[PDB]
């Protein structure tokens, strides 16, 4: 499956980041073999037709284009990062850093809310968007 077209070329991915400016660009640097990236792709497909009018999500393979995993240092098996009009917005997840999500978010509503908040912060220009979630914990009990 993986209906989201993965930008094979690194320069193609960079141009795609420079392609759209009025919406949210999310790149899934996870390798499609691992099950975690499969769950991330499933979550994206859940929000494929929802956040489409406000965002443009693309997949990525760190093996295909390695420059993204060597310059941005995306060492996680499946890290979700955002870039808005040549500005990598930071989501205030609270996991020590804000460059990636790094978690296999199995909740479609949580992903949709995060996308909406990221879009609102990008519109407001805040480079560090306050994520409306307590991602610092496992959020399970």
């Amino acid at each position: 499956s993986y209906m989201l077209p993965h930008l094979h070329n690194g320069w193609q991915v960079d141009q795609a980041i420079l392609s759209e400016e009025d919406r949210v660009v999310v790149i899934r640097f996870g390798h499609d073999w691992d099950p975690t990236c499969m769950k991330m792709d499933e979550v994206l497909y859940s929000i494929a037709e929802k956040v489409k009018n406000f965002a443009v999500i693309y997949l990525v393979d760190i093996t295909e284009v390695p420059d993204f995993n060597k310059m941005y240092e995306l060492y996680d098996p499946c890290t979700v990062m955002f870039f808005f009009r040549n500005k990598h917005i930071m989501i205030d997840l609270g996991t020590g850093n804000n460059n990636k999500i790094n978690w296999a978010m199995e909740d479609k509503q949580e992903m949709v809310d995060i996308i909406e908040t990221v879009y609102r912060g990008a519109r407001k220009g805040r480079g560090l968007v306050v994520s409306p979630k307590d991602y610092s914990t496992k959020y399970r009990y």
Binding site: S1, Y2, M3, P5, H6, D32, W33
Partner: peptide
């Protein structure tokens, strides 16, 4: 299109 990528991913898993 997506068929080739899906087949490639399946063949490695």
């Amino acid at each position: 299109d997506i068929e080739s990528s899906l087949k490639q991913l399946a063949e490695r898993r």
